């Protein structure tokens, strides 16, 4: 049939596009070019295309062949999102520190290395502080959960997870780079307050109000509770500005 | 030795036994060795394939076996193949049962073997027998799974899939029997029999999901089930496995059922409460008799009587044959239950009985007899004398069916197989692997039931929608479920009738049938899209009990329980519930809020439900797949306006407002004109249906029920229910009281049964029948949930009990005029019905009582063996309303536990007019087989005049009341019924009394 | 005592003593419970 050959068309493409920089074990892709290191807020946003394709293919795959290739698609995705989430899971100190007061210097890393999943420049070379990669991998994480892709395993992450959502709480008064990692409007980048972070924690924070990571078999401790006068606040903040 | 000198044996047995007398030209054996004979059996020749197949199988473990396997699995084959083109040459026979069974129409069993074609009529051997087809599907899936092949193209597919849809519906049809003969009495009738449904149960378990090519398979080669049929398959066997049949306390063919063919009694303590009783009551020395008081073939039958006179089965006892067959049988079952000291037993039983060739071969004679010198003398002592063997038992005639049995039993014996071996698809399991099997029993174990049913909440409109989450009610409107569909059960019927469809001989497929509540339980995908649909109880319907709401509670509730109960399959199921915003109706929205927030509680009346978004709960589900369409007061009186001219009958429905008036004058225009009139409205059928629909929306229940009458539209569910209460044993007659009744014995269709029933509400009355659909339907539902409530009544009669609830409900009104029973609500009706059904206590009048206990037609426990006491130690007879009874003939044709008698005596207590006097009567007859119980000395020297003693029994009563309290001589027995059976003065010592006279004189 | 019980008190058990040291890092016991090997 034509979607058939279509959607073969479209794996090909993504294949020799995307898949073939996946680099295994670790999971992450590299940032482009020769640079060497893994950006989080690029590599999330690289894998909407995979995911939107596996929800294609599983939906008309009926074949022992197609199952198996939306199965891969899913897992790969799986895989990177673990990825993911063991890079931040193993600065649990620097969370610690930032949750009380508000510094440049007790914030995490925005740019992570490959394999080892090591880091690559101090906190005094690079401006590590980037509300909406966080808020949008969060949102994120939150959509495939709720389509049904399995990315947590063990309570402690779920604890973490609650810690990084009071993490990304007070984004309606703290100060951020930016997107584009350069500050203010100039050069000597001075923390100054942007609308994108404010909106991309706002639908983070409304995502994972009552969506267990558990899925359908979960239990009454599966849940994460956020509140809502944070939402309230970012939304008046984002209507003014 | 080596297990080389063994196999050859057994091949020079089988060759000089079995194959020596296959017919080339059809591959099945014939039922006689001797002299020629063109007849044959079908169950003789499956067995003898099955026997050939199981030395195949044991042979099969010789890789030097030099092609002894290739021909027994390629004379097998042959023999499938034979059966299978017999079959499928009769056609039109198929077809014709398909939609109305009958034994013209019921498919050939018995044919030429030359030339596989029909030979002796239909008239004088009834051709109706189904447990042959039930086993022949067995043994084919059974080959099948072992690894042989025996279906070419797809067309015979299509020919499996109809012979499934013939034999589903074998539930209600009566048969012949295994032995032909049906009743015990041998007049030419036809009864239910357990074995049959067992085996027909069995074969739907196995054929269930099954690839039909073998090891390759894609979408040709699968079959589909229903699971309606199957459940009320056990529901039938459950009821009717203590008792084989109603005319036969027990029987040898309820072996081979219970056994290695079918093994399908998973209930252990009354498997072995049957086992016990057969063996206790059919044991003999040479054998295993067919049943009791059975003159087959015996010394004193005659080749000139096919149908038996009455009263010669009394002559015919005491000289049953013997079937050495069964120790077979017995020792198969032993070896499969790992008991080896049965199988010993009855090896050392079954040894000196077995004969010999010339060259020693062992021989099973069929039947054992007795000479005629010793008819007498075996009466007096059971079993002290000799049989002798059968003319097969010698030289020139053989029994290849137990020739067949004994190889096989003796190669299970000798341990050259395993039982796996010879059961591939595992029919048996043992207690401690019933834990995870598909469609036996449930993942929770056998003694646990804790199912957990999802329930989907979806809302209809948007507005209602708002309105319910207003008050935190949480519901979903259809238009946002895009990806999901939501369809009615019509659609699935009809996809189901577009299947089993074949141009070179002519299907029609599926039969347009309603699907049950486990059937829509699933999710199914038609051409790439999920269909899910939801039970008929939601649809709108015609009728008016589906506006009352206690009544829908109590559906859904009962249908919550059913799916609770009979749920098996793996995977959780799905329940949809739909909410109207009609329903709430203002002032009846706060019930519908207690039932909802019960159910967001958890638990349901001790059923726990799962709530939660549909797409959700279908995501990682399994999905069923349907892949076969791709491939494919009044102002108006009857009197005073039946004169009425046409066009003032028409200015009167104009101007007039009022819904009963409106009524009868459509049903007056309809009488006289016709249904095709047209009116201001349009036709005379569109202005009543516009009128009944309007009735219904306002549910005055009087309109509406004339309306319904109107229409004449029956409910889809009587079948069910009258198909029940004949197998649980009760009767059923429809009628109204005081008028003609019709008496229903036996299942009938349902064309005949609506024609009987319309016929006479056009002669009697008017809305009686929606009055007695209702109540059907009512009696049903309780005898199905509450089945100790209609203990000790045999006769349901629905005129009657109409009468005693408006006898009821007067009492209860007093000065109050009495209500009509037109206008009561559905919930009152139930409630008026279950209130008088009730056991009844004291307060109330005992005339009362008594009225409504001869009404219901209640008997005592053990009247009937009390009376059959009776009539034995009665040497003249009971008369009673100028009916007789003589003692000779009901001793001389029935038993002690006959249904048969049971009837007679019910026929004989009928005559009674005052069900007062019959429960009176019966009371007495109590009270006269006690004391004759309780002393043996005293007897009656005549015949007893009941009514003489009931006469004497108020003339002394009269006495005494004048004695005490003053008063004259008053007509009629009224008083005598107020007075209660037992206290200071009762009518039981009037009773007795009356007794000690007649006895003493 | 149904087999909630057992199965409650063999939760407890579990968790008390094999699942209580697991490393959230890595998923793999250590060799010692003390020290911080």
New interface residues.
């Given amino acids: 049939s034509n979607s058939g050959v279509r959607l073969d068309g479209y794996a090909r493409l993504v294949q020799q596009t995307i898949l073939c920089h996946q680099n295994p074990v670790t999971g992450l892709l590299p940032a482009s070019y020769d640079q060497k290191d893994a950006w989080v807020r690029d590599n999330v946003y690289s894998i909407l295309a995979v995911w939107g394709l596996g929800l294609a293919y599983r939906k008309?795959a009926?074949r022992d062949e197609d199952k198996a290739k939306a199965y891969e698609l899913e897992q790969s995705v799986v895989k990177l999102m673990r990825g993911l989430l063991?890079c931040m899971?193993?600065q649990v100190d620097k969370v610690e520190s930032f949750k009380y007061s508000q510094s440049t210097k007790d914030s995490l890393h925005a740019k992570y290395n490959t394999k080892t999943c090591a880091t690559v420049v101090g906190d005094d070379q690079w401006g590590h502080l980037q509300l909406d990669a966080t808020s949008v991998y969060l949102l994120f994480l939150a959509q495939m959960t709720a389509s049904?892709l399995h990315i947590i395993h063990?309570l402690?992450?779920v604890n973490?997870i609650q810690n990084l959502v009071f993490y990304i709480e007070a984004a309606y008064k703290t100060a951020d780079f930016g997107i584009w990692e350069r500050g203010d409007k100039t050069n000597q980048g001075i923390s100054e307050l942007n609308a994108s972070s404010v909106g991309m924690a706002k639908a983070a924070l409304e995502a994972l109000d009552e969506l267990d990571l558990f899925?359908?078999k979960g239990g009454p401790q599966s849940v994460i509770h956020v509140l809502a006068d944070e939402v309230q606040h970012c939304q008046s903040i984002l209507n003014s500005l | 030795e080596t297990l080389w000198d063994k196999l050859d044996h057994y091949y020079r047995i089988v060759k000089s036994t079995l194959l020596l007398y296959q017919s080339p030209t059809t591959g099945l054996f014939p039922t006689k060795t001797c002299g020629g004979d063109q007849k044959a059996k079908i169950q003789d020749s499956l067995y003898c394939a099955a026997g050939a197949w199981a030395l195949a199988l044991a042979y099969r473990r010789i890789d030097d076996d030099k092609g002894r396997t290739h021909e027994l699995e390629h004379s097998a084959i042959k023999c499938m193949r034979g059966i299978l083109y017999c079959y499928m040459r009769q056609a039109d026979k198929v077809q014709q049962f398909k939609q109305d069974p009958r034994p013209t129409t019921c498919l050939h069993s018995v044919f030429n073997v030359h030339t596989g074609d029909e030979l002796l009529s239909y008239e004088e051997y009834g051709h109706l027998q189904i447990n042959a087809v039930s086993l022949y599907l067995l043994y084919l899936v059974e080959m099948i799974s072992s690894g042989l092949q025996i279906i070419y193209n797809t067309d015979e597919v299509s020919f499996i899939q109809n012979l499934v849809f013939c034999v589903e519906r074998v539930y209600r049809v009566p048969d012949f029997g295994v032995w032909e003969r049906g009743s015990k009495y041998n007049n030419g009738s036809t009864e239910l029999h357990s074995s049959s449904v067992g085996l027909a149960k069995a074969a739907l378990e196995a054929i269930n999901g099954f690839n039909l090519f073998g090891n390759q398979g894609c979408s040709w080669s699968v079959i589909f089930v229903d699971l309606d049929a199957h459940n009320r398959n056990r529901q039938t066997l459950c009821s009717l496995l203590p008792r084989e049949s109603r005319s036969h306390n027990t029987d040898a063919a309820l072996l081979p059922c219970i056994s290695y063919p079918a093994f399908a009694l998973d209930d252990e303590v009354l498997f072995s409460q049957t086992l016990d009783k057969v063996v206790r009551k059919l044991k003999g020395k040479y054998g295993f008799k067919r049943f009791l008081r059975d003159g087959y073939r015996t010394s004193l039958e005659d080749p000139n009587r096919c149908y038996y006179k009455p009263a010669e089965i009394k002559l015919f006892d005491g000289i049953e044959c013997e079937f050495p067959i069964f120790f077979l049988y017995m020792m198969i079952d032993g070896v499969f239950r790992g008991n080896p000291k049965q199988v010993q037993e009855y090896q050392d039983l079954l040894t000196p009985v077995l004969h010999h060739t010339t060259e020693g071969y062992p021989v099973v004679p069929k039947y054992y007899y007795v000479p005629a010198d010793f008819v007498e003398y075996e009466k007096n002592n059971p079993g002290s004398q000799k049989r002798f063997p059968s003319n097969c038992g010698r030289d020139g005639k053989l029994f290849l069916w137990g020739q067949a049995l004994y190889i096989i039993a003796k190669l299970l014996a000798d341990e050259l197989i395993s039982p796996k071996d010879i059961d591939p698809v595992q029919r048996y399991v043992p207690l401690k692997d019933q834990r995870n099997v598909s469609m036996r029993f449930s993942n929770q174990g056998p003694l646990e039931n804790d199912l957990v049913v999802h329930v989907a909440l979806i809302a209809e409109s948007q507005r209602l929608q708002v309105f319910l989450n207003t008050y935190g009610i949480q519901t979903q409107t259809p238009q946002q479920v895009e990806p999901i569909q939501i369809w009615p059960q019509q659609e699935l019927v009809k996809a189901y009738l577009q299947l089993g469809i074949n141009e070179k001989l002519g299907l029609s497929g599926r039969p347009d049938r309603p699907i049950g509540c486990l059937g829509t339980s699933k999710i199914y995908r038609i051409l790439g899209k999920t269909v899910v649909c939801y039970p008929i109880i939601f649809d709108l319907s015609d009728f008016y009990m589906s506006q009352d709401v206690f009544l829908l509670i109590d559906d859904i509730k009962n249908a919550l329980q059913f799916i609770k109960q009979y749920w098996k399959m793996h995977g959780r199921p799905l329940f949809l519930v739909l909410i109207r915003e009609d329903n709430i109706r203002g002032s009846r929205f706060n019930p519908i809020l207690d039932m909802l927030a019960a159910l967001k509680k958890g638990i349901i009346g001790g059923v726990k439900v799962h709530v939660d978004r549909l797409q959700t709960l279908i995501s990682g589900a399994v999905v069923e797949q349907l892949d076969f369409l791709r491939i494919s007061q009044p102002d108006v009186n009857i009197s005073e306006w039946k004169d009425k001219p046409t066009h003032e009958i028409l200015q009167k429905l104009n101007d007039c407002s009022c819904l009963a008036s409106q009524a009868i004058l459509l049903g007056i225009l309809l009488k006289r004109e016709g249904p095709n009139f047209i009116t201001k409205e349009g036709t005379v059928s569109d202005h009543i249906e516009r009128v009944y629909r309007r009735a219904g929306s306002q549910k005055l229940w009087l309109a509406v029920r004339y309306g319904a009458a109107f229409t004449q539209k029956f409910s889809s569910s009587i079948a069910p229910h009258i198909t029940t209460f004949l197998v649980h044993g009760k009767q059923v007659t429809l009628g109204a009281f005081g008028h003609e009744e019709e008496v229903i014995s036996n299942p009938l269709s349902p064309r005949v049964i609506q024609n009987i029933i319309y016929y006479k509400c056009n002669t009697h009355d008017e809305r009686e029948a929606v009055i007695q659909q209702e109540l059907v339907i009512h009696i049903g539902w309780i005898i199905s949930n509450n089945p100790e409530l209609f203990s000790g009544m045999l006769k349901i009669r629905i005129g009657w009990i109409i009468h005693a609830m408006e006898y009821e409900l007067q009492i209860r009104g007093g000065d109050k005029p009495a209500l009509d029973l037109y206008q009561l609500s559905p919930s009152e009706v139930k409630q008026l019905l279950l209130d008088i059904l009730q056991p009844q206590q004291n307060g109330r009048c005992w005339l009362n009582r008594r009225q409504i206990d001869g009404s219901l037609n209640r008997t005592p426990t053990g009247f009937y063996d009390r009376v059959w006491q009776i009539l034995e130690r009665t040497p003249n007879g009971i008369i009673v309303a100028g009916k007789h009874l003589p003692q000779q003939p009901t001793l001389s044709d029935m038993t002690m536990y006959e249904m048969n008698f049971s009837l007679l005596v019910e026929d004989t207590l009928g005559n009674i007019d005052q069900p007062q006097y019959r429960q009176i009567v019966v009371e007495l007859l109590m009270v006269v087989s006690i004391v004759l119980e309780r002393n043996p000395e005293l007897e009656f020297q005549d015949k007893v005049d009941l009514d003489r003693l009931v006469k004497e029994a108020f003339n002394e009563f009269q006495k005494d009341q004048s004695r005490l309290k003053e008063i004259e001589k008053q007509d009629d027995m009224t008083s005598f019924y107020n007075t209660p059976p037992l206290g200071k003065r009762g009518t039981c010592s009037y009773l007795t009394k009356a007794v000690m006279n007649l006895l003493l004189e």
């Fill in positions: 008309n009926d063991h899971i193993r049904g063990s402690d992450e973490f899925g359908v």
